Amino acid sequence: PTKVMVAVNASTIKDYPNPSISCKRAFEWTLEKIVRSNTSDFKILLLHVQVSIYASPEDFRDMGLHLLEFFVNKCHEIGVGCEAWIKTGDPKDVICQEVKRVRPDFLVVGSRGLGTVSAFCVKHAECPVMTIKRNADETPSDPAD
Amino acid sequence: PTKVMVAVNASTIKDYPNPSISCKRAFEWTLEKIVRSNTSDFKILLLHVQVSIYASPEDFRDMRQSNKAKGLHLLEFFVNKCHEIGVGCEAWIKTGDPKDVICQEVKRVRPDFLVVGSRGLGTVSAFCVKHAECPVMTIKRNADETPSDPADD
Numbered sequence: 001p002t003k004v005m006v007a008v009n010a011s012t013i014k015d016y017p018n019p020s021i022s023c024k025r026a027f028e029w030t031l032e033k034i035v036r037s038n039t040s041d042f043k044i045l046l047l048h049v050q051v052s053i054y055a056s057p058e059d060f061r062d063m064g065l066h067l068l069e070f071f072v073n074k075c076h077e078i079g080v081g082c083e084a085w086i087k088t089g090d091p092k093d094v095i096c097q098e099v100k101r102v103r104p105d106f107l108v109v110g111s112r113g114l115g116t117v118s119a120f121c122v123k124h125a126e127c128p129v130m131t132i133k134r135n136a137d138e139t140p141s142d143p144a145d
Numbered sequence: 146p147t148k149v150m151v152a153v154n155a156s157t158i159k160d161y162p163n164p165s166i167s168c169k170r171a172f173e174w175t176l177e178k179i180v181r182s183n184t185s186d187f188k189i190l191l192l193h194v195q196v197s198i199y200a201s202p203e204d205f206r207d208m209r210q211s212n213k214a215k216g217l218h219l220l221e222f223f224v225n226k227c228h229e230i231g232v233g234c235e236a237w238i239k240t241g242d243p244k245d246v247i248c249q250e251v252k253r254v255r256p257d258f259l260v261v262g263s264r265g266l267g268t269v270s271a272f273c274v275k276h277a278e279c280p281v282m283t284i285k286r287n288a289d290e291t292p293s294d295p296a297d298d
């Protein structure tokens with residue numbers, strides 16, 4: 001079973017807990033075009049890298065995981081096996097550290113196509129890397145978003 | 146069926162008409178890890194980018210070693226590889242600057258993704274990842290087939 005690591009992160013423009021447009025597209029494309037209906041031939045490894053006094057009812061209302069849950073649901077829905085977890089530190093380094101630890105067959109990263117993370121992975125990950133850029137119609141006017 | 150474009154080129158260290166170590170690794174890896182036994186779920190699109198008076202027998206040997214011929218022999222190697230395991234394929238040659246042409250071909254043919262080998266030098270693979278208008282899979286060579294000078298392919 002081909003182990004596909006998918007680096008997933010939060011959106012900075014879409015409200016929380018939405019995944020970034022880039023990693024969502026990358027994830028969905030991978031399921032559409034790579035996994036297809038062959039759901040037992042692949043295993044998705046979802047990695048997200050992450051960087052008390054109460055005085056009124058209001059303070060209780062005010063009071064990474066929900067991201068992972070979005071993708072785990074997507075996998076469950078079409079029946080692909082997955083494992084999802086969080087590690088801490090600099091995302092591009094940690095992704096690479098996790099590639100050498102987990103040894104997935106390849107790494108999927110979205111990319112905003114700005115020329116940080118996706119470029120470093122391609123350069124340094126110790127497995128093949130699939131870089132997926134956003135569709136034109138879902139690319140924000142400012143590509144950095 | 147997922148259209149997989151695979152950019153293939155000739156080796157400069159291996160005698161002709163051998164594929165480069167990197168694109169060979171790239172192709173074989175894709176068959177092994179992506180296509181697997183599901184040979185009808187994928188279609189391989191093999192692209193090679195290529196960069197008359199005869200006076201002596203030697204001129205005919207040269208012709209047979211031209212880029213055109215280096216090109217076709219290259220395509221035939223991969224088409225045989227596809228046919229052997231029963232994966233549908235299409236293979237052709239375009240002319241010009243390889244990185245530019247690969248990208249032009251991506252937008253013309255519209256494959257679901259592009260597979261390129263990579264020597265891991267930090268020319269072609271990095272340009273594709275940056276510019277191709279489809280997903281790009283970059284596959285580097287195994288340690289044990291990487292020549293002492295990584296520029297060699």
Ligand SMILES: Nc1ncnc2c1ncn2[C@@H]1O[C@H](COP(=O)(O)O)[C@@H](O)[C@H]1O
Nearest residue numbers: 007008009023049091109110112117118
């Ligand atoms: N904090 C993170 N944790 C896991 N993956 C990340 C993280 N940040 C970025 N990525 C990956 O990098 C992609 C964006 O790459 P880039 O545009 O080069 O920053 C996202 O689609 C993710 O695949």
Ligand SMILES: Nc1ncnc2c1ncn2[C@@H]1O[C@H](COP(=O)(O)O)[C@@H](O)[C@H]1O
Nearest residue numbers: 152153154167168194261262264269270
């Ligand atoms: N003439 C060419 N035609 C098609 N693909 C090429 C050509 N030259 C290089 N490539 C692709 O670029 C890869 C090498 O990438 P790089 O080491 O980054 O130059 C090869 O493995 C091929 O996948």
